[PDB]
């Protein structure tokens, strides 16, 4: 388990919050993101 996403619509009409953990850091950002259809974090 390496991150979380929070929001209303989770698409560009709306703001949403992203948390990603990369083992050097926890990175947190709040944008009018566009999400992928099946989100993933690298091998």
């Amino acid at each position: 388990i390496r991150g979380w996403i929070f929001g209303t619509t989770l698409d560009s009409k709306t703001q949403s919050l992203l948390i990603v953990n990369n083992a050097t850091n926890v990175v947190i950002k709040v944008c009018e993101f566009q999400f992928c259809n099946d989100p993933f974090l690298g091998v």
Binding site: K13, T14, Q15, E32
Partner: protein, 50 residues
């Protein structure tokens, strides 16, 4: 008129404290759908003070 400054004129529900909705989706005032374009019951959500 300065048109760089704006306020939201319409919303579906009131903001909670320190909530900050920047969405520019067209305000549907009634049963008429917007489909991404302005029209009857379908109005741009911001105004500029001018």
């Amino acid at each position: 008129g300065n048109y760089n400054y704006l306020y939201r004129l319409f919303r579906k529900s009131n903001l909670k404290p320190f909530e900050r909705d920047i969405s520019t989706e067209i305000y549907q005032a009634g049963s008429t759908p917007c489909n991404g374009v302005k029209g009857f019951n379908c109005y741009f959500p911001l105004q500029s003070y001018g």
